[PDB]
CSV table of C-alpha atoms in Angstrom, one decimal:
chain,number,residue,atom,x,y,z
A,1,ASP,CA,0.1,0.1,0.0
A,2,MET,CA,1.3,3.2,-1.0
A,3,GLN,CA,0.6,6.2,1.1
A,4,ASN,CA,0.3,9.9,0.6
A,5,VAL,CA,2.4,11.3,-2.0
A,6,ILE,CA,3.6,14.9,-1.2
A,7,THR,CA,5.7,17.4,-3.7
A,8,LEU,CA,7.6,20.3,-2.2
A,9,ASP,CA,6.9,23.0,-5.0
A,10,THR,CA,7.9,25.9,-2.6
A,11,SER,CA,11.4,26.4,-1.5
A,12,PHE,CA,10.9,24.9,1.8
A,13,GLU,CA,9.3,28.0,3.2
A,14,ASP,CA,5.8,29.0,4.8
A,15,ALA,CA,6.2,25.6,6.6
A,16,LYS,CA,3.7,23.9,4.1
A,17,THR,CA,6.8,21.6,3.8
A,18,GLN,CA,6.8,21.0,7.3
A,19,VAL,CA,2.9,20.1,7.2
A,20,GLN,CA,3.4,17.9,4.4
A,21,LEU,CA,6.4,16.0,5.9
A,22,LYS,CA,4.4,15.9,9.4
A,23,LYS,CA,1.3,14.5,7.6
A,24,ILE,CA,3.4,11.2,6.6
A,25,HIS,CA,4.3,8.9,9.4
A,26,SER,CA,5.9,5.5,8.1
A,27,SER,CA,8.8,3.5,8.5
A,28,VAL,CA,10.0,4.0,4.8
A,29,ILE,CA,10.5,7.5,3.3
A,30,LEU,CA,11.4,7.9,-0.4
A,31,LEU,CA,13.2,11.2,-1.1
A,32,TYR,CA,13.9,12.5,-4.7
A,33,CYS,CA,15.3,16.0,-5.0
A,34,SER,CA,18.6,17.8,-5.7
A,35,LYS,CA,21.8,17.4,-3.7
A,36,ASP,CA,21.5,20.9,-2.0
A,37,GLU,CA,17.7,20.4,-1.4
A,38,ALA,CA,18.2,17.1,0.2
A,39,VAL,CA,20.9,18.8,2.6
A,40,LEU,CA,18.2,20.8,4.1
A,41,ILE,CA,15.3,18.3,3.7
A,42,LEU,CA,17.2,15.9,6.0
A,43,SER,CA,17.7,18.7,8.5
A,44,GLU,CA,14.0,19.4,8.6
A,45,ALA,CA,13.3,15.7,8.9
A,46,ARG,CA,15.9,15.5,11.8
A,47,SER,CA,13.9,18.7,13.5
A,48,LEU,CA,10.5,16.7,12.8
A,49,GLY,CA,12.0,13.5,14.3
A,50,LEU,CA,12.0,11.3,10.8
B,1,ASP,CA,-10.1,9.0,28.8
B,2,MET,CA,-6.9,11.1,29.0
B,3,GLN,CA,-4.6,10.6,25.8
B,4,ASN,CA,-0.8,11.2,25.8
B,5,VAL,CA,0.4,14.4,27.1
B,6,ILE,CA,3.9,16.1,26.2
B,7,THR,CA,4.8,18.8,28.3
B,8,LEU,CA,7.1,21.5,26.5
B,9,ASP,CA,9.2,24.1,28.5
B,10,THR,CA,12.4,25.7,26.7
B,11,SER,CA,13.3,28.8,24.7
B,12,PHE,CA,12.3,29.9,21.3
B,13,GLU,CA,15.2,27.8,19.6
B,14,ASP,CA,16.7,24.4,19.5
B,15,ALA,CA,13.9,23.5,16.9
B,16,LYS,CA,11.5,22.4,19.6
B,17,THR,CA,7.7,22.3,19.7
B,18,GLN,CA,7.7,20.6,16.1
B,19,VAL,CA,9.8,17.8,17.5
B,20,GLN,CA,6.8,16.5,19.6
B,21,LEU,CA,4.0,18.2,17.8
B,22,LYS,CA,3.7,15.3,15.1
B,23,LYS,CA,1.3,12.9,16.5
B,24,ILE,CA,0.2,14.2,20.1
B,25,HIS,CA,-1.1,17.5,18.7
B,26,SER,CA,-3.9,16.5,16.7
B,27,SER,CA,-6.6,18.3,19.0
B,28,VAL,CA,-6.2,21.6,21.0
B,29,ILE,CA,-2.7,22.5,22.1
B,30,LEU,CA,-2.5,24.4,25.6
B,31,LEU,CA,-0.3,27.6,26.0
B,32,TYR,CA,1.1,28.7,29.3
B,33,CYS,CA,3.0,31.8,28.7
B,34,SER,CA,2.4,35.5,29.4
B,35,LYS,CA,1.3,38.2,27.0
B,36,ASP,CA,4.6,38.7,25.1
B,37,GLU,CA,5.7,35.2,25.6
B,38,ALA,CA,2.5,34.0,24.2
B,39,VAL,CA,2.8,36.4,21.2
B,40,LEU,CA,6.0,35.2,20.4
B,41,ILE,CA,5.2,31.5,20.5
B,42,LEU,CA,2.1,32.0,18.4
B,43,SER,CA,4.3,33.9,15.9
B,44,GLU,CA,6.4,31.1,15.8
B,45,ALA,CA,3.4,28.7,15.3
B,46,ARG,CA,2.4,30.6,12.6
B,47,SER,CA,5.9,30.4,10.9
B,48,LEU,CA,5.4,26.8,11.3
B,49,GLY,CA,2.9,24.3,10.9
B,50,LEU,CA,0.5,24.9,13.8
């Protein structure tokens, strides 16, 4: 079963990306973005306990 | 039936609040601040997904 799919169109601002990452709660997460984008995406995940 | 409760007491840094407000904050969140402190906390919540 594939759960909700979230796309972070904005530049990780307005905390909507935080809302999308908080909505999903699973043991397996698939991330697909640029290197620099993932650099701070992982930091946001760490700050969100992911 | 009392659900899970997490108490948070810290400053406005260290990327707090959102660490625990992922699966325990679905319903009403209680704020225990003063006037200016509550204003700052609610500004941070507005800047976040709360």
